[model samples]
Target: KETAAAKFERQHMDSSTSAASSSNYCNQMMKSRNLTKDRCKPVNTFVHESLADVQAVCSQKNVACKNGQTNCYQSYSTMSITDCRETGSSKYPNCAYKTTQANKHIIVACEGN
Candidate 1:
Protein backbone atom coordinates (compact mmCIF):
# COMPACT_ATOMS: atom_id res chain seq x y z
CA LYS A 1 0.00 0.00 0.00
CA GLU A 2 1.33 3.45 -0.88
CA THR A 3 0.67 6.43 1.31
CA ALA A 4 -0.47 9.62 -0.35
CA ALA A 5 2.70 11.39 0.70
CA ALA A 6 4.76 8.59 -0.75
CA LYS A 7 2.84 8.71 -3.97
CA PHE A 8 3.21 12.47 -4.13
CA GLU A 9 6.95 12.33 -3.65
CA ARG A 10 7.25 9.54 -6.11
CA GLN A 11 5.40 11.47 -8.78
CA HIS A 12 6.90 14.91 -8.19
CA MET A 13 10.51 14.25 -7.30
CA ASP A 14 11.45 10.74 -8.22
CA SER A 15 9.60 10.61 -11.52
CA SER A 16 11.60 13.39 -13.14
CA THR A 17 14.95 13.05 -11.37
CA SER A 18 15.21 9.33 -11.76
CA ALA A 19 14.47 9.55 -15.44
CA ALA A 20 16.86 12.48 -15.80
CA SER A 21 19.73 10.32 -14.65
CA SER A 22 19.77 8.64 -18.05
CA SER A 23 18.05 11.10 -20.38
CA ASN A 24 17.75 14.79 -21.12
CA TYR A 25 14.90 17.13 -20.11
CA CYS A 26 12.47 16.22 -22.86
CA ASN A 27 13.16 12.54 -22.43
CA GLN A 28 12.78 12.77 -18.70
CA MET A 29 9.36 14.33 -19.20
CA MET A 30 8.48 11.33 -21.33
CA LYS A 31 9.66 9.07 -18.56
CA SER A 32 7.49 10.84 -16.03
CA ARG A 33 4.51 10.47 -18.36
CA ASN A 34 5.00 6.72 -18.52
CA LEU A 35 5.42 6.34 -14.77
CA THR A 36 2.37 8.44 -13.97
CA LYS A 37 0.29 6.37 -16.32
CA ASP A 38 1.39 3.21 -14.55
CA ARG A 39 1.03 4.49 -10.99
CA CYS A 40 -2.22 6.45 -11.19
CA LYS A 41 -4.25 3.39 -12.15
CA PRO A 42 -5.46 2.72 -8.62
CA VAL A 43 -6.89 6.22 -8.40
CA ASN A 44 -8.59 6.16 -11.76
CA THR A 45 -6.49 9.07 -12.95
CA PHE A 46 -5.05 9.13 -16.41
CA VAL A 47 -2.39 11.52 -17.69
CA HIS A 48 -2.10 11.71 -21.45
CA GLU A 49 0.59 14.33 -21.97
CA SER A 50 4.23 14.66 -21.09
CA LEU A 51 5.71 16.78 -18.32
CA ALA A 52 6.32 19.34 -21.00
CA ASP A 53 2.60 19.95 -21.13
CA VAL A 54 2.55 20.66 -17.44
CA GLN A 55 5.45 23.01 -17.82
CA ALA A 56 3.64 24.91 -20.46
CA VAL A 57 0.57 25.33 -18.30
CA CYS A 58 2.53 26.68 -15.38
CA SER A 59 4.43 29.10 -17.54
CA GLN A 60 1.29 30.26 -19.26
CA LYS A 61 0.25 33.88 -18.67
CA ASN A 62 3.37 34.43 -16.56
CA VAL A 63 1.77 33.30 -13.33
CA ALA A 64 5.13 32.71 -11.72
CA CYS A 65 6.10 36.27 -12.48
CA LYS A 66 3.96 37.37 -9.56
CA ASN A 67 4.34 34.38 -7.24
CA GLY A 68 7.93 35.25 -6.31
CA GLN A 69 10.81 32.93 -5.51
CA THR A 70 11.44 30.26 -2.85
CA ASN A 71 8.08 28.67 -3.25
CA CYS A 72 6.32 26.09 -5.41
CA TYR A 73 2.69 26.55 -6.39
CA GLN A 74 0.12 24.47 -8.18
CA SER A 75 -2.71 25.53 -10.44
CA TYR A 76 -6.33 24.49 -10.13
CA SER A 77 -7.85 26.53 -12.89
CA THR A 78 -8.89 23.53 -14.94
CA MET A 79 -10.43 20.17 -14.31
CA SER A 80 -7.92 18.15 -16.34
CA ILE A 81 -4.89 20.29 -15.67
CA THR A 82 -2.35 20.84 -12.88
CA ASP A 83 0.29 23.53 -12.57
CA CYS A 84 3.42 23.50 -10.44
CA ARG A 85 5.77 26.35 -9.74
CA GLU A 86 9.21 25.75 -11.24
CA THR A 87 10.63 29.21 -10.65
CA GLY A 88 13.76 29.80 -8.60
CA SER A 89 16.45 32.35 -8.00
CA SER A 90 18.87 33.15 -10.75
CA LYS A 91 21.74 32.08 -8.54
CA TYR A 92 21.45 28.47 -9.62
CA PRO A 93 19.33 27.99 -12.66
CA ASN A 94 19.77 24.45 -13.87
CA CYS A 95 16.64 23.79 -15.87
CA ALA A 96 14.51 26.00 -18.05
CA TYR A 97 12.44 28.99 -16.92
CA LYS A 98 9.08 27.33 -17.39
CA THR A 99 7.16 25.77 -14.48
CA THR A 100 5.35 22.38 -14.20
CA GLN A 101 1.73 21.29 -14.09
CA ALA A 102 -0.01 18.01 -14.77
CA ASN A 103 -3.45 16.58 -14.40
CA LYS A 104 -5.62 16.97 -11.31
CA HIS A 105 -4.51 13.45 -10.62
CA ILE A 106 -1.06 14.73 -9.75
CA ILE A 107 -2.35 17.21 -7.20
CA VAL A 108 -4.40 14.45 -5.65
CA ALA A 109 -1.39 12.16 -5.46
CA CYS A 110 0.45 14.81 -3.48
CA GLU A 111 -2.38 14.72 -0.96
CA GLY A 112 -3.34 18.25 -1.73
CA ASN A 113 -4.62 19.94 1.32
Candidate 2:
Protein backbone atom coordinates (compact mmCIF):
# COMPACT_ATOMS: atom_id res chain seq x y z
CA LYS A 1 0.00 0.00 0.00
CA GLU A 2 1.05 3.65 -0.47
CA THR A 3 -0.22 7.15 0.22
CA ALA A 4 -3.99 6.81 -0.25
CA ALA A 5 -4.62 10.51 -0.77
CA ALA A 6 -2.15 10.94 -3.59
CA LYS A 7 -3.02 7.59 -5.06
CA PHE A 8 -6.69 8.52 -5.22
CA GLU A 9 -5.88 11.80 -6.89
CA ARG A 10 -3.83 10.15 -9.56
CA GLN A 11 -6.38 7.45 -10.23
CA HIS A 12 -9.67 9.29 -9.98
CA MET A 13 -9.34 13.04 -10.14
CA ASP A 14 -10.22 14.80 -13.42
CA SER A 15 -11.53 18.09 -11.94
CA SER A 16 -12.37 19.51 -15.37
CA THR A 17 -13.66 18.40 -18.76
CA SER A 18 -17.43 18.41 -18.67
CA ALA A 19 -17.18 15.97 -21.53
CA ALA A 20 -14.36 14.40 -23.45
CA SER A 21 -13.71 15.88 -26.87
CA SER A 22 -11.79 12.86 -28.09
CA SER A 23 -12.21 9.14 -28.04
CA ASN A 24 -8.46 8.96 -27.50
CA TYR A 25 -8.91 10.15 -23.94
CA CYS A 26 -8.32 6.81 -22.26
CA ASN A 27 -5.23 6.02 -24.26
CA GLN A 28 -3.92 9.53 -23.78
CA MET A 29 -4.74 9.67 -20.07
CA MET A 30 -3.59 6.19 -19.15
CA LYS A 31 -0.30 6.85 -20.86
CA SER A 32 -0.14 10.37 -19.49
CA ARG A 33 -0.73 9.07 -15.96
CA ASN A 34 1.64 6.15 -16.51
CA LEU A 35 -1.01 3.50 -15.98
CA THR A 36 -0.11 2.11 -19.38
CA LYS A 37 3.63 2.35 -18.83
CA ASP A 38 3.85 -1.30 -17.85
CA ARG A 39 0.37 -2.73 -18.28
CA CYS A 40 -2.76 -1.85 -20.21
CA LYS A 41 -5.41 -1.18 -17.62
CA PRO A 42 -8.58 -3.03 -18.67
CA VAL A 43 -10.80 -0.38 -17.22
CA ASN A 44 -10.63 2.99 -15.46
CA THR A 45 -12.75 5.97 -14.53
CA PHE A 46 -12.34 9.76 -14.41
CA VAL A 47 -14.34 12.10 -12.23
CA HIS A 48 -15.41 15.38 -13.81
CA GLU A 49 -15.92 16.93 -10.39
CA SER A 50 -13.19 18.43 -8.27
CA LEU A 51 -11.06 16.35 -5.88
CA ALA A 52 -12.68 17.95 -2.85
CA ASP A 53 -16.11 17.39 -4.37
CA VAL A 54 -15.57 13.68 -4.34
CA GLN A 55 -13.76 13.83 -1.00
CA ALA A 56 -16.91 15.03 0.67
CA VAL A 57 -18.47 11.75 -0.45
CA CYS A 58 -16.38 9.92 2.14
CA SER A 59 -18.60 11.30 4.86
CA GLN A 60 -21.95 10.98 3.05
CA LYS A 61 -22.68 7.36 3.86
CA ASN A 62 -20.62 4.24 4.04
CA VAL A 63 -21.44 1.50 1.56
CA ALA A 64 -19.97 -1.80 0.47
CA CYS A 65 -17.39 -1.65 -2.24
CA LYS A 66 -17.35 -4.19 -5.06
CA ASN A 67 -14.67 -6.00 -3.06
CA GLY A 68 -17.03 -6.26 -0.09
CA GLN A 69 -15.23 -3.56 1.88
CA THR A 70 -17.31 -1.02 3.77
CA ASN A 71 -15.24 1.94 2.67
CA CYS A 72 -17.07 3.08 -0.42
CA TYR A 73 -19.39 6.07 -0.54
CA GLN A 74 -21.74 7.40 -3.20
CA SER A 75 -21.71 11.01 -4.21
CA TYR A 76 -24.54 13.18 -2.94
CA SER A 77 -25.58 14.04 -6.48
CA THR A 78 -25.36 12.08 -9.65
CA MET A 79 -22.06 13.22 -11.05
CA SER A 80 -20.54 13.27 -14.50
CA ILE A 81 -18.08 10.44 -15.00
CA THR A 82 -16.24 8.82 -17.83
CA ASP A 83 -15.53 5.13 -18.09
CA CYS A 84 -12.73 3.72 -20.18
CA ARG A 85 -12.41 0.13 -21.28
CA GLU A 86 -9.54 -1.33 -23.21
CA THR A 87 -10.16 -2.60 -26.71
CA GLY A 88 -9.11 -6.14 -27.61
CA SER A 89 -6.24 -4.69 -29.60
CA SER A 90 -4.92 -2.91 -26.50
CA LYS A 91 -1.21 -3.39 -25.88
CA TYR A 92 1.20 -1.65 -23.56
CA PRO A 93 2.75 0.53 -26.23
CA ASN A 94 -0.56 1.10 -28.04
CA CYS A 95 -3.21 1.35 -25.42
CA ALA A 96 -6.55 1.35 -27.26
CA TYR A 97 -9.82 2.13 -25.53
CA LYS A 98 -13.55 2.77 -25.78
CA THR A 99 -14.79 5.72 -23.79
CA THR A 100 -18.25 5.84 -22.26
CA GLN A 101 -19.73 9.04 -20.88
CA ALA A 102 -22.20 8.99 -18.04
CA ASN A 103 -23.96 11.02 -15.38
CA LYS A 104 -24.64 9.03 -12.27
CA HIS A 105 -23.84 8.82 -8.61
CA ILE A 106 -20.21 7.88 -8.26
CA ILE A 107 -19.27 5.10 -5.90
CA VAL A 108 -15.68 5.20 -4.74
CA ALA A 109 -13.56 4.42 -1.72
CA CYS A 110 -11.92 7.08 0.41
CA GLU A 111 -9.92 7.13 3.64
CA GLY A 112 -9.91 9.15 6.85
CA ASN A 113 -12.61 11.48 8.10
Candidate 3:
Protein backbone atom coordinates (compact mmCIF):
# COMPACT_ATOMS: atom_id res chain seq x y z
CA LYS A 1 0.00 0.00 0.00
CA GLU A 2 1.23 3.52 -0.71
CA THR A 3 1.64 5.94 2.14
CA ALA A 4 -0.28 9.19 2.18
CA ALA A 5 2.90 11.23 1.79
CA ALA A 6 3.95 9.21 -1.22
CA LYS A 7 0.54 9.55 -2.78
CA PHE A 8 0.60 13.30 -2.26
CA GLU A 9 3.94 13.64 -4.01
CA ARG A 10 2.81 11.58 -6.94
CA GLN A 11 -0.41 13.48 -7.49
CA HIS A 12 0.68 17.04 -6.74
CA MET A 13 4.36 17.53 -7.47
CA ASP A 14 5.73 18.09 -10.99
CA SER A 15 9.04 19.91 -11.25
CA SER A 16 9.29 19.58 -14.99
CA THR A 17 6.04 21.10 -16.17
CA SER A 18 6.73 24.78 -15.66
CA ALA A 19 4.04 26.06 -17.98
CA ALA A 20 0.97 24.62 -19.62
CA SER A 21 1.00 25.74 -23.26
CA SER A 22 -1.96 23.70 -24.43
CA SER A 23 -5.39 24.03 -22.90
CA ASN A 24 -5.64 20.28 -22.90
CA TYR A 25 -2.76 19.93 -20.48
CA CYS A 26 -4.94 18.80 -17.61
CA ASN A 27 -6.87 16.35 -19.76
CA GLN A 28 -3.70 14.53 -20.73
CA MET A 29 -1.70 14.98 -17.54
CA MET A 30 -4.53 13.89 -15.28
CA LYS A 31 -4.75 10.64 -17.11
CA SER A 32 -1.02 10.14 -17.59
CA ARG A 33 -0.41 10.82 -13.93
CA ASN A 34 -2.84 8.09 -12.94
CA LEU A 35 -5.29 10.47 -11.29
CA THR A 36 -7.96 9.30 -13.72
CA LYS A 37 -7.81 5.64 -12.88
CA ASP A 38 -11.24 4.59 -11.64
CA ARG A 39 -12.89 7.97 -11.96
CA CYS A 40 -11.95 11.50 -12.90
CA LYS A 41 -10.49 13.64 -10.19
CA PRO A 42 -12.82 16.60 -10.49
CA VAL A 43 -10.18 19.08 -9.42
CA ASN A 44 -6.48 18.86 -8.70
CA THR A 45 -3.41 21.11 -8.61
CA PHE A 46 0.06 20.19 -9.72
CA VAL A 47 2.94 22.22 -8.34
CA HIS A 48 5.95 22.91 -10.51
CA GLU A 49 8.61 23.18 -7.88
CA SER A 50 11.21 21.13 -6.12
CA LEU A 51 10.09 18.51 -3.65
CA ALA A 52 12.17 20.15 -0.95
CA ASP A 53 10.46 23.49 -1.51
CA VAL A 54 7.06 21.87 -1.11
CA GLN A 55 8.11 19.97 2.01
CA ALA A 56 9.33 23.21 3.55
CA VAL A 57 5.74 24.45 3.68
CA CYS A 58 5.27 22.48 6.87
CA SER A 59 7.27 25.12 8.74
CA GLN A 60 6.08 28.15 6.76
CA LYS A 61 2.59 29.04 7.90
CA ASN A 62 -0.14 27.35 9.87
CA VAL A 63 -3.55 26.61 8.41
CA ALA A 64 -6.56 24.44 9.10
CA CYS A 65 -7.59 21.52 7.00
CA LYS A 66 -11.10 21.07 5.62
CA ASN A 67 -11.97 18.93 8.65
CA GLY A 68 -10.45 21.56 10.94
CA GLN A 69 -7.20 19.74 11.54
CA THR A 70 -4.08 21.91 11.97
CA ASN A 71 -2.10 19.78 9.55
CA CYS A 72 -2.27 22.15 6.64
CA TYR A 73 0.34 24.65 5.47
CA GLN A 74 0.53 27.35 2.82
CA SER A 75 3.52 28.15 0.69
CA TYR A 76 5.21 31.51 1.10
CA SER A 77 6.17 32.15 -2.52
CA THR A 78 4.10 32.12 -5.66
CA MET A 79 4.69 28.91 -7.56
CA SER A 80 3.97 27.57 -11.00
CA ILE A 81 0.97 25.31 -10.88
CA THR A 82 -1.55 23.77 -13.20
CA ASP A 83 -5.16 23.42 -12.12
CA CYS A 84 -7.18 20.57 -13.56
CA ARG A 85 -10.94 20.90 -13.50
CA GLU A 86 -13.22 18.32 -15.04
CA THR A 87 -15.49 19.64 -17.75
CA GLY A 88 -19.26 19.58 -17.29
CA SER A 89 -19.72 17.25 -20.22
CA SER A 90 -17.03 14.91 -18.98
CA LYS A 91 -17.93 11.30 -18.30
CA TYR A 92 -16.23 8.28 -16.80
CA PRO A 93 -13.63 6.42 -18.90
CA ASN A 94 -13.59 9.51 -21.11
CA CYS A 95 -12.76 12.17 -18.57
CA ALA A 96 -12.06 15.67 -19.83
CA TYR A 97 -10.36 18.53 -18.07
CA LYS A 98 -9.77 22.23 -18.50
CA THR A 99 -6.28 23.40 -17.66
CA THR A 100 -5.38 26.70 -16.12
CA GLN A 101 -1.90 27.88 -15.23
CA ALA A 102 -1.27 30.14 -12.34
CA ASN A 103 1.32 31.35 -9.89
CA LYS A 104 -0.05 31.20 -6.41
CA HIS A 105 0.69 30.04 -2.91
CA ILE A 106 -0.40 26.46 -2.47
CA ILE A 107 -2.10 25.15 0.63
CA VAL A 108 -1.37 21.53 1.36
CA ALA A 109 -2.25 18.96 4.00
CA CYS A 110 0.76 17.37 5.63
CA GLU A 111 1.30 14.35 7.87
CA GLY A 112 4.33 13.82 10.02
CA ASN A 113 5.59 13.21 13.54
Lowest summed lDDT over 10 consecutive residues: which window, candidate 2? Answer: 12-21
Relative to the unseen true structure, what is the C-alpha lDDT of residue 110 in candidate 1, on a scale of 0 to 100? 18
lDDT of 1 by residue, 10-56 (tens): 44443323222221342244335444233222122223345555444
- The local lDDT score (0 to 100) that residue 56 gets in candidate 3 is 94
Q: Give the per-residue lDDT of model 3 (tens digit) for 1-113.
A: 98888888888888887778689888888988899899999999888888899999888888998899888898888889998999999999999998999999988888783
Tell me, by TM-score, which candidate is best. 3
Best to worst by lDDT, what's the order? 3, 2, 1
The global C-alpha lDDT for each of the candidates, from Candidate 1 onward, is 0.35, 0.81, 0.88
Q: In model 3, where do residues sit more than 4 Å from their true spots?
A: none
Candidate 2 regions exceeding 4 Å error are none
- Poorest stretch of ten by lDDT in candidate 1: 90-99
Q: How do all the candidates rank in terms of TM-score, highest first? A: 3, 2, 1
Q: Each candidate: RMSD to true structure?
A: 15.7, 1.7, 1.2
What lDDT, from 0 to 1, does candidate 1 have?
A: 0.35
